Design a protein around this ligand. Structure first.
Ligand SMILES: *[C@@H]1O[C@H](CO)[C@@H](O[C@@H]2O[C@H](CO)[C@@H](O[C@@H]3O[C@H](CO[C@H]4O[C@H](CO[C@H]5O[C@H](CO)[C@@H](O)[C@H](O)[C@@H]5O)[C@@H](O)[C@H](O[C@H]5O[C@H](CO)[C@@H](O)[C@H](O)[C@@H]5O[C@H]5O[C@H](CO)[C@@H](O)[C@H](O)[C@@H]5O)[C@@H]4O)[C@@H](O)[C@H](O[C@H]4O[C@H](CO)[C@@H](O)[C@H](O)[C@@H]4O[C@H]4O[C@H](CO)[C@@H](O)[C@H](O)[C@@H]4O)[C@@H]3O)[C@H](O)[C@H]2NC(C)=O)[C@H](O)[C@H]1NC(C)=O
Ligand SMILES: NS(=O)(=O)C1CCN(C(=O)C2CC3=C(C2)CN(C(=O)c2cc(OCC4CCOCC4)nc(C4CC4)c2)C3)CC1
Ligand SMILES: NS(=O)(=O)C1CCN(C(=O)C2CC3=C(C2)CN(C(=O)c2cc(OCC4CCOCC4)nc(C4CC4)c2)C3)CC1
Ligand SMILES: [Ca+2]
Ligand SMILES: [Ca+2]
Ligand SMILES: [Cl-]
Ligand SMILES: [K+]
Ligand code: NA
Ligand SMILES: [Zn+2]
Length: 805
């Protein structure tokens, strides 16, 4: 829209509030709206004499034409060149100073809290920290002397706006709404693009980003965004000038963004020899900032975060898959292409368009096919990439180093580029960086890798703000912090369990399936009773029972080898917990326990499954949560065939589940010196990442009230010190978990005609999960009763086992 650009920026340069149409603008974003006053360049973007003081300029008379100053008044004016005190007052560059612990904020009088400066680097791959260390001394000083992770995991897709906005909000893209760098919203009937004006409309941007959270709570925020044409040196000088403002106008939070190294990375690849110079240049910018802070006596006052959005992979246009090689109908689709694919109908008036036929035509068609198609609800749940109408139903997960495109003309265009990003967020090349330096961060401390969704909470903790509701786990990053830790309380248990005893006779049941229990001494008779009353429960429930965080009716069921929380509403366990020692033996299913299920005399027939429904349902079979293969004794093996341990399983999924239970659990116990396993169903028919209520379930076992899970989870816990057995661990724990999709075929696994040893593990790795993912999906809270700090437990709950080298 039109602006009066006739007015002036005099005494307004980089003003901290964005003035409306009646005026022309002088803020750091004015150029991006073509709204600056005519004299913005002249007054606000000075360049004369460059960015550095020289000996000749020391004690110059102030000339207001200069980009920066070397006059005696510059310190109190806050506009010296960042090297002024080095060149003119015999001081050292910050990077040449030994690091010294910052135990408290050393701030000028009138500072109410340490400022936070967020320095974001686009496309800064995690491995640049080591690989570029010789050319980035300032960054290396921040890293070594402050708090750093070896890498930080971005969100999917590993694109720029989704990640930058996740850093801003603590939200998954599905929640904040920036699901891609390009998007179509069918409700608005509008398109969002990198180029163009639509991206500036507020309706795209969900959640509450840090600058708003700060403003709403009375903390002044620096104008976060810089028009691209403003040179980095000017952005630095501007932040330092703002930090020199009076107490009642000075921001408490600042942001710097660099388009490098992403710009060069796309052209040259992540490690192209051309990459050295951009890394040197970013390091020089960091050194300007630190030297400038040091001049202002703020270098032991501010907290600095050095963070990236995502990494960068080698991708060249010869590694392109074309949908025109697969689809005969290729002109009837719209593709959002590149390092991910999203497909929809070109016209909503095409009644032929059929997603099922599209998926089929894209599935395992070429031997080394470098993408895989998914309906979005079938994507790995760790990606949290489905619950937004801007995400098309059909998704293509693209292999690292490749692109997908609709037709070969479209690519001639990725042949002028050698790098890209966007792939699955567990891919090593997509990982990025985190360093925190300052009074509130720890000193010379390495922390484990963590996800970028956690940072918003921490930025809030650094500024004294209450975060808006978000997808971080607040407290899981307390180990990065010297002070201002957030100490939450465990959620309160909402439903208390029943503990049913023996209440039903065998003949009350009509299961249609019933084992012929033929076997029939008081040493063992009291033993069986004590096991049913929970005498072995300390062995199998190592960390307390899970708490149920919603209103329901459920029963705790005790057994020799396993304990369960059985839902009377869903007719199956919510959780089954058991411990397998390193010594445990695997056994096979005896004939008196084949093709049959036993009534559980603690649970009414009306609250039990039955076998007739499985017989009648020609598509659905059943498996067991506690694995009968791992029963401790032949007497205990009967418990594994109780109807209360049965769950609905498609025969295709049974292949996966049996291999897990019969092969992998024991392998893990051998490798990890025992494991504790908690397994159960998940119902997420509306693909929102949250536990379904009973009225959301779309599929039941034929002719019954038995709901069919969308997924099966397992949480596998052992001692981080693997010289201690899982059931006698004195210290921190180790965990890996999965959320496997409960699918009626193995179309996902292109090698599934082979033996399970050639494909099931690969599937499970792709569907690796955090405990916290499982908690959202089940309304359960785990690790209630450990010896450990609750924040250490929150860290453990956010861990993801990625399987990357
Ligand atoms: C990740 O973390 C996030 C954040 O915690 C989790 O996301 C939250 O999840 C909740 C459950 O799905 C969801 O609760 C909704 O809220 C509905 C109100 O939503 C609107 O207002 C929200 C609050 O706005 C105000 O406050 C904030 C505070 O900071 C300010 O910044 C605001 O400016 C306001 O002052 C607002 O956040 C929300 O934003 C969404 O929608 C926008 C479009 O308007 C998008 O721009 C934005 O990106 C958000 O979009 C996401 O979320 C929506 C779902 O809301 C989703 O569809 C999108 O795909 C996208 O994912 C809205 O503007 C409320 O109406 C809902 O109530 C129904 O269900 C409840 C259950 O208790 C019923 O009891 C209730 O009766 C009600 O039923 C009625 O309506 C039904 C639905 O239409 C209808 O069918 C029925 O018959 C009834 O009539 C429910 O409470 C939060 O909205 C959501 N927040 C965000 C930001 O996403 C997320 O779950 C976490 N993920 C995981 C995996 O853990
Ligand atoms: N990869 S690619 O897309 O092929 C490539 C294309 C070319 N390209 C550009 O044109 C850049 C993209 C971009 C520019 C210019 C300026 N810019 C911001 O000023 C910004 C900062 C921010 O910072 C958010 C901060 C929140 C706190 O944590 C640190 C980040 N957030 C947001 C928007 C999300 C709101 C925006 C983002 C680079 C990327
Ligand atoms: N230059 S750029 O980086 O492409 C540009 C992106 C858009 N942008 C925004 O402020 C949006 C608008 C809005 C946000 C983020 C949060 N809410 C309302 C300015 C920076
Ligand atoms: Ca980026
Ligand atoms: Ca759900
Ligand atoms: Cl995209
Ligand atoms: K069946
Ligand atoms: Na297959
Ligand atoms: Zn990029």
């Amino acid at each position: 829209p039109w602006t009066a650009t006739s007015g002036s920026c005099k005494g307004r340069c980089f003003e901290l509030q964005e003035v409306g149409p009646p005026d022309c603008r002088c803020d750091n974003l004015c150029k991006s709206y073509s709204s600056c006053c005519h004299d913005f360049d002249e007054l606000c973007l000075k360049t004369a004499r460059g960015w550095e003081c020289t000996k000749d300029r020391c004690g110059e008379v102030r000339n207001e034409e200069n980009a920066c100053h070397c006059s005696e008044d510059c310190l109190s004016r806050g506009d010296c060149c960042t090297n002024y005190q080095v060149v003119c007052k015999g001081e050292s560059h910050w990077v040449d100073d030994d690091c010294e612990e910052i135990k408290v904020p050393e701030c000028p009088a009138g500072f109410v809290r340490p400022p936070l400066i967020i320095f974001s680097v686009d496309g800064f791959r995690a491995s640049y920290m080591k690989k570029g260390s010789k050319v980035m001394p300032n960054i290396e000083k921040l890293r070594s002397c402050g708090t750093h992770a070896p890498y930080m995991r971005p969100v999917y897709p590993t694109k720029t706006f989704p990640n930058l906005y996740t850093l801003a909000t603590g939200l998954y893209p599905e929640s904040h709404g920036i699901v891609g760098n390009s998007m179509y919203d069918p409700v608005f009937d509008a398109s969002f693009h990198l180029r163009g004006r639509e991206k500036f409309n507020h309706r795209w941007w969900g959640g509450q980003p840090l600058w708003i959270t700060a403003t709403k709570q009375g903390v002044r925020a620096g104008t976060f965004f810089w028009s691209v044409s403003i040179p980095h040196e000017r952005r630095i000088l501007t932040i330092l000038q703002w930090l020199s403002l009076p107490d009642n106008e000075r921001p408490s939070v600042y942001a710097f963004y660099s388009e490098q190294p992403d710009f060069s990375g796309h052209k040259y690849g992540p490690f192209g020899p051309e990459m050295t110079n951009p890394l040197r240049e970013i390091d020089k910018t960091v050194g300007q900032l630190m030297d400038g802070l040091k001049q202002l006596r703020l270098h032991r006052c501010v907290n600095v975060i050095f963070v990236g959005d995502h990494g960068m992979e080698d991708v060249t246009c010869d590694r392109t898959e074309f949908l025109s090689n697969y689809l005969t109908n290729v002109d009837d689709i719209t593709l959002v292409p590149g390092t991910l694919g999203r497909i929809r109908a070109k016209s909503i008036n095409n009644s032929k368009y059929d997603p099922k036929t599209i998926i089929a035509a894209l599935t395992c068609k070429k031997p080394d096919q470098h993408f895989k198609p998914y309906m979005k609800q079938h994507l790995p749940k760790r990606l949290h990439y489905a619950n937004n109408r801007r995400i098309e139903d059909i998704h293509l997960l693209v292999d690292r180093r490749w692109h997908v495109a609709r037709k070969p003309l479209d690519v001639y265009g990725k042949c002028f580029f050698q790098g890209d990003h966007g792939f699955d967020n567990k891919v090593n090349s997509m990982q990025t960086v985190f360093v925190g330096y300052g009074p509130t961060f720890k000193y010379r401390t390495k922390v484990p890798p963590f996800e970028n969704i956690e940072l918003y909470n921490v930025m809030c903790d650094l500024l004294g703000l209450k975060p808006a509701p978000n997808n971080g786990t607040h407290g899981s990053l307390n180990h990065l912090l010297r002070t201002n830790t957030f100490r939450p309380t465990m959620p309160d248990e909402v439903s208390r369990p029943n503990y049913p005893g023996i209440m039903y006779l065998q003949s009350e049941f009509d299961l249609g399936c019933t084992c012929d229990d033929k076997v029939e001494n008081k040493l063992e008779e009291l033993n069986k009773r004590l096991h049913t009353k929970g005498s072995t429960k300390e062995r199998h429930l190592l960390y307390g029972r899970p708490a149920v965080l919603y209103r329901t009716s459920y029963d705790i069921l005790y057994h020799t080898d396993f304990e369960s929380g059985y839902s009377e509403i869903f007719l199956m366990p919510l959780w089954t917990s058991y411990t397998i020692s390193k010594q445990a033996e695997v056994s096979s299913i005896p004939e008196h326990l084949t093709n049959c299920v036993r009534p559980d005399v603690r649970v009414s027939p009306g609250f039990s499954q039955n076998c007739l429904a499985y017989k009648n349902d020609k598509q659905m079979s059943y498996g067991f949560l506690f694995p009968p293969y791992l029963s401790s004794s032949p007497e205990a093996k009967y418990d594994a065939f109780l109807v209360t341990n049965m769950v609905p399983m498609y025969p295709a999924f049974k292949r996966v589940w049996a291999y897990f239970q019969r092969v992998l659990v024991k392998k893990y116990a051998s490798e990890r010196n025992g494991v504790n396993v908690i397994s159960g169903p998940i119902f997420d028919y509306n693909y929102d990442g949250l536990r379904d209520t009973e009225d959301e379930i779309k599929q039941y076992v034929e002719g019954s009230s038995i709901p069919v899970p969308t997924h099966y989870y397992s949480i596998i816990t052992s001692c981080l010190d693997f010289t201690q057995p899982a059931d006698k661990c004195d210290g921190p724990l180790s965990v890996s978990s999965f959320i496997l999709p409960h699918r009626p075929d193995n179309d996902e696994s292109c090698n599934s005609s082979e033996d399970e040893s050639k494909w099931v593990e690969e599937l499970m790795k792709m569907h690796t999960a955090r405990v916290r993912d499982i908690e959202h999906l089940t309304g359960l809270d785990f690790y209630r009763k450990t010896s450990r700090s609750y924040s250490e437990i929150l860290t453990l709950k956010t861990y993801l086992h990625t399987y990357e080298s």
